[PDB]
Symmetry: D2
Subunit: 441 residues, 4 copies
Amino acid sequence: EARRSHEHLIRLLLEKGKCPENGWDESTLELFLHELAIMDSNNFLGNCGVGEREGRVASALVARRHYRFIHGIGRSGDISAVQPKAAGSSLLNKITNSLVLDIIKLAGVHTVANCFVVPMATGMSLTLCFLTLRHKRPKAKYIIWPRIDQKSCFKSMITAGFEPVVIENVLEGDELRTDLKAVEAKVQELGPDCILCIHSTTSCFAPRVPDRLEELAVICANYDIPHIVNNAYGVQSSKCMHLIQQGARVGRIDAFVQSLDKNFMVPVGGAIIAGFNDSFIQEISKMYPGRASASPSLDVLITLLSLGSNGYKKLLKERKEMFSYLSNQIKKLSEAYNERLLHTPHNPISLAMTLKTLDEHRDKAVTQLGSMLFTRQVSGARVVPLGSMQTVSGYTFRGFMSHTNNYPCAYLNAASAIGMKMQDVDLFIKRLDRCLKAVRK
Amino acid sequence: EARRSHEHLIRLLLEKGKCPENGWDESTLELFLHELAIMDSNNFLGNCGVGEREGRVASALVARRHYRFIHGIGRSGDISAVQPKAAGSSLLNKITNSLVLDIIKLAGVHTVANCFVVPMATGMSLTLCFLTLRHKRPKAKYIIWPRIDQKSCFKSMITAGFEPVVIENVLEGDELRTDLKAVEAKVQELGPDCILCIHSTTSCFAPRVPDRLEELAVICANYDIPHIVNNAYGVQSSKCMHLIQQGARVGRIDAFVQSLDKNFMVPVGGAIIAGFNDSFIQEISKMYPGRASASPSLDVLITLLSLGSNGYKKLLKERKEMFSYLSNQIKKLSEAYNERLLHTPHNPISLAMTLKTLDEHRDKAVTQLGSMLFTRQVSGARVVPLGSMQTVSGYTFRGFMSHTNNYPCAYLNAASAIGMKMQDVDLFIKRLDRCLKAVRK
Amino acid sequence: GCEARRSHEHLIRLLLEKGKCPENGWDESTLELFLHELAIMDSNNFLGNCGVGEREGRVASALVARRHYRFIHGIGRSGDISAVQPKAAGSSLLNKITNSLVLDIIKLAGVHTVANCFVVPMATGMSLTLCFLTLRHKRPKAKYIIWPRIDQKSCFKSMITAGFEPVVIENVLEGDELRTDLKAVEAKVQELGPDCILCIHSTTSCFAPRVPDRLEELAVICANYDIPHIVNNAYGVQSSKCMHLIQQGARVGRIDAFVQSLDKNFMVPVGGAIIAGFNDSFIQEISKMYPGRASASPSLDVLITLLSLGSNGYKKLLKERKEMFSYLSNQIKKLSEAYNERLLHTPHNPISLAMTLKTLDEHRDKAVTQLGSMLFTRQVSGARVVPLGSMQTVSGYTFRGFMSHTNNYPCAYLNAASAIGMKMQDVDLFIKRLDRCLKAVRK
Amino acid sequence: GCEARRSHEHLIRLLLEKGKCPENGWDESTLELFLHELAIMDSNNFLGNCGVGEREGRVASALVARRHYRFIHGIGRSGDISAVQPKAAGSSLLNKITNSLVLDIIKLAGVHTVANCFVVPMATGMSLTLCFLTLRHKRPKAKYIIWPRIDQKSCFKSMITAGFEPVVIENVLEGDELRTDLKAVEAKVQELGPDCILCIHSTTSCFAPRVPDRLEELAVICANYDIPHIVNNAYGVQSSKCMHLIQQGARVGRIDAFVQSLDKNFMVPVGGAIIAGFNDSFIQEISKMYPGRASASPSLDVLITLLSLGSNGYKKLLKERKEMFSYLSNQIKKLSEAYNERLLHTPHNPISLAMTLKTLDEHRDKAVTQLGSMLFTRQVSGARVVPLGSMQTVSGYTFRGFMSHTNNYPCAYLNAASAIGMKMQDVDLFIKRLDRCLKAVRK
RNA sequence: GCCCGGAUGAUCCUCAGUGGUCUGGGGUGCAGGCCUGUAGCUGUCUAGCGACAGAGUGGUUCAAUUCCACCUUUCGGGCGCC
Ligand SMILES: *Cc1c(COP(=O)(O)O)cnc(C)c1O
Ligand SMILES: *Cc1c(COP(=O)(O)O)cnc(C)c1O
Ligand SMILES: *Cc1c(COP(=O)(O)O)cnc(C)c1O
Ligand SMILES: *Cc1c(COP(=O)(O)O)cnc(C)c1O
């Protein structure tokens, strides 16, 4: 009976709800998971069910792959409530949220008040935030939104039933940045009462850079306007998390959203809503109708308990290193072809190399390069050609994917995101070169 | 090389996208699943990723438990679009939707036009429907809603940012039913233009019964008002599915929603949106911002391929049998205590036994019985006491859980839902008796 | 809330107290909780672990570690396959328990007087060999093993591998059946002398038309001449007839050990066996004759299985085999008529059946050998086809009329058996595919 | 889209063509695709299946079927553990391949001249026994096995289980080391006569202060007197020193077979071994001496492992063991000084180290025996403690000064070894816990 | 079992024919005076009355029983000499 050392790791978790510093062994992890699962009624031995929702499972494969967690999280009114029918799942939800909160502090935002995991995409998660704000601000019709050419967060505003006010970005050197004048101009033109919130974005593709959060946080605190931050994959960026921390300090940040897959290397499908006003975060929680999947929370729990805060820190560290490596490698490859690495110092995660030497009109070289890269099995390589027209839920974007009507050149994206390895870079550079050379002939 | 017999089962699936009549063996199933998984870029061998979302997975346990399906379903604009980054997942989504459509026909609604799985609860899934309708009907403020005391679908209307018009139910014998007069009275009072849609419910707890769908479908077709059906767990009920089929025939049904767990015995977290106008169903699909989890679609795929349409039919058949068995068993137990089985012929799934012999005021017997049942490990047993006051998102319900301000008596719920076994019933009856006897002393 | 575990613990504590099969099969949840609880008792899985030995339990592949529920150290110590291993308390405990359940099953199955038994991670043939190896030291003058013929290479070679010379006693034709030639056995005990005989090696489960050896008679011959008696019960645990017969032998004569296969009697993967006896002492001797540690895989497999089925589970399987043996039989009768063949009368075989194939010309159309592969390509396994005049050499010994258990059986025949786990669909598929197979030959 | 499979197929086709370890480890996805592809080739997994046999591959527990990747039929046929099984083409193929990878690894590891080898689902001790069993038939007059002493019950008992009488040749003290007494061996060949000797049984991998037997010298003695030579290479595959030594013996003398454990050399669960030789012929003879079918579990485990590690993977492990052996050593030196003990000089052992424990009074404070369990409760496995004057009886033979490999070794000592898979944390944890363990005894 | 094609799967049964709201040959059960009129199914709702759908899955096409793919079944052909 030295299972006391497992008991001890577990007792420590339940007591302080923080990430283990060093990862648990699978043995401890699975032991724990089973102790939880058997607390859910559907797994009770002496159990009869006479309800419509009893966690009955027809496939052994399904039961096993979810570690016998079938009931989901929350009750009918609360995606945060305890349900005597699934005591184990309820406890699971509480812990994983706590672990997440811990990581969010450790990642940069130490003054985060509260947060919760929600089994939706980042897009829908933002929508939930807008749906919640509507009730707090019934006269509001518009969301003010510093442009970013990513369909999910844009659509999120329309799905919620509000009208986006696209605030274009100001070009500074090579970087696209927040037009603080225009924002404050609009809030005045439309009037704060009519503004649902300011919807800013941190993580994004170069040449766009993380919005001027603190400046916006002030505009928001001043005019009493809610500030929601799309931090889709900014948790892995101490620069990004710092911005959030700061804006909340000198100003107002009502909620920030991040994606589970982009920040924690788990399957697509979950997100985190986080804030500094505890009461308001829970209002968003309460806005969710019915129970939700536990699958994303389970993945997060498993990943974090397995990595430990140390494991996570390591990854964050490697990410930075890979960023330099990638940047420096692109500078070199870039030279050999008379292109350059766009000067985007303020973007911690994403880089862009120019493609001015390829002409997209005579022959479709810039487009052609996109396909070649794909067929050569290079994912994430994002070619951005000049002058793309595109409609998204009625609104028409000029020069779409460039984040502004008329950017100087066509370029190509790459990023050091969490999990990336040197091989990723070397193979990229190796294959990008091969593609460029191919386009010459 | 007799793997031709596996190839053949699979080729048959892809070709006609129907449920196998008889279940596949795990061997075939897993073979298939792996062939899909390896079509997703993240699983390619010669793959480098330089994006922010590459399906990177830190836990081997996570990767394995999802059969290496990490990318989710859909793209940024479409939870139904193909993504070259996840060809396998995209194909997975298409097939599982097809299988589902097949089951939905086979279950009663043969004239279903289109449907899709969505990684949300039934509550949020309904919300999505309201969020979509808003754009089609910008002047609309209210949803007309024949009362049902279930927090999730009620909240769903408010989360979507609309105002519920609670239409009370008419008592007929022991049954609570649709007040068709009041509905048409309200549509006239408020005016069709101001009505977002009529929100009816089929599956529910006795003594409420499935709404008069066809009659409502007509009111809706007449006044040009959208009709959305909460069919939460009605797929398992040929009576319920028939109603839907019919309403669509003599009238208008724009979309019906069902829950994945309640109808297919998989973990809580997914739902199905289904309709008869193909174009409109896809409009709801397009309304979803960003990618979504594949976890619910994978469970459904696995379950159905494993059961086959035969397996499913068997379950549906057993459900009916269990219903009689349960009903007849309650009639008997009921007698011995001078209670009775409420006369609710029109409710195919749920039964109710009275509890008039226990007085909830002197001693709290009706409440006490609820706890005793729980501690004795009987789930689904739903005690409904008289006169419960309760607020849900501002609105105050009188006699909550009874579905009407003043129902004749206190009663107790039980249901034959899919998956239930005889043991469930016998243990229930055995333990309910034991509890009642206990309350006497 | 942590009282949900109470129900699980009751099931486990009960197992650890009495070591009997649970009457009703366990639930996967309970089973896996238990397995994990055992595995963390093993030193390799300790959290505060450092290893400086050459055998520490290290596992390179997670896949491997997972699939064996983190049981790595195998079973036993260097000295005893019986001894508890300080390094691996969990595996040790797993092993005590598996042997217990298996003993429990053996009684339930017909041999209620069974003294002791153990699982050994070898095939049946190799497990027999182990018995012989143990007997050698008890009988140093012994060179011969007396063996009523049965055409199956493993049990036959088990004797040669052990270092002895098989003395093949030909069978007696009694009606349709092939039975023990008791007079021939005694003749050989006398000719060679008891002191030169290591043991008599008898077989229970086997193919028709052969039937189980006359254990009672042989048990007495052995008692009288003071010769050990080893019984090959390969797949006889599923037969109350076979088991009761073993029990009878032990009651009236001597039976030193009976061996049976794991995969044939418990529907687990090949590779495991049970050695069982009526003298606790002697059984332990064979156990201690095993050199070093052994795989825990076969034990794990039967533990999981027995725990999942429960006494009732296993019993039910046993009943359904009988029911299927009746069915399969009638079906052969019917098919026989239709084709001018017959179901050879072999009442004394509870498992295997034989159908005639006289109407097939193998010396003309070679219809008998060609029907073999026909049943094969058409996906019928277990269907053994037996020609006349097969010659086969096995380790230097040449058999005449091989596969038939005698030099000249009346006719060519076809085997089919009702083994545990067989479902109605199995017979129906067999009968159908055979009818098609025979029609085909006509053309 | 179905071209994503192309990359996977290249890896597989390459494996099936040359049967060499992939240089770089496979990816789980590829590995599992392959395994499933094999398993569906087995008749038990066929879709159109009916079984009427007594051994059909039926599995009662899904758990069991899953954990074995649906490989149920085991390996071989009744005749050969070498023969392809019509019933189980998949398992057959799995087995050919495993043997191939293992052969590949054995060359890479030092014995480049290796003729053939096979995996056998038995322990090393039992696998040795099998070798002996095979030799018996080649040398019917043989009663004795000549064996340079090494205190380990399994390899010792392997000889008795096989039915022979071990002739224990005491070792020679040379410096700190214990080595082969070549003059003593020859004395016994002469006294007993080559014709009475089944074989000489030598050991490579072992505990300090003993070191690997002088294979070269012994290989020649064997060549001259025409005596077979069986080498116990239990955990020597991880040592290029041991392997090169085996290769040398084969070059200048005779070595009939060398046996090695699976779990000790490949970090898989206990229960498997490899029998290897330089005469393809003789190796096949031992293979055919195995009676019946065998478990596929041990083969599966090494296949998965080797396929996952790749040549490079395994090589790296081999390099890191060396590096750790250096480390562990220096660390013992340092600790020795601090405590007035020393690292016994045993340059000829590449794996095991010994530290003195002279400063401990076992006849006064019993400090030596009590430090044994101390290292144990404090969670240090593999740390063997060796007192003076241990007496032990093993199968009737009584050892004096047991565990030390001689009757009177100068001092009490403590073993620690750098076995494959050992990590720096292992040494550090050991050194720390030992320092604490020794401090403790002072009080 | 895998491969190759001829038919077949459910409008009283069987044969024959054929892209047009099916047309013949024969036979059978019930009704009426050889003639003439009708002749079964299953699934869902229903107390019942009765009503509502489905003739393999889909595809071509103004329209298919009648074409084309596939599936169910049944017949024939070749593969099978552990
Ligand atoms: C289950 C159910 C719902 C939806 O509940 P969710 O938790 O959102 O899946 C809605 N209405 C009724 C009557 C239900 O039973
Ligand atoms: C990934 C991402 C989102 C959210 O996308 P989902 O598919 O909804 O998770 C939003 N904005 C940006 C910039 C993103 O990269
Ligand atoms: C491990 C070992 C053996 C064989 O032991 P088994 O448990 O039977 O595998 C033999 N000799 C030595 C030196 C060993 O270390
Ligand atoms: C199966 C069997 C054996 C043993 O075969 P193994 O493959 O070694 O387990 C012995 N005799 C008979 C009659 C058998 O059926």
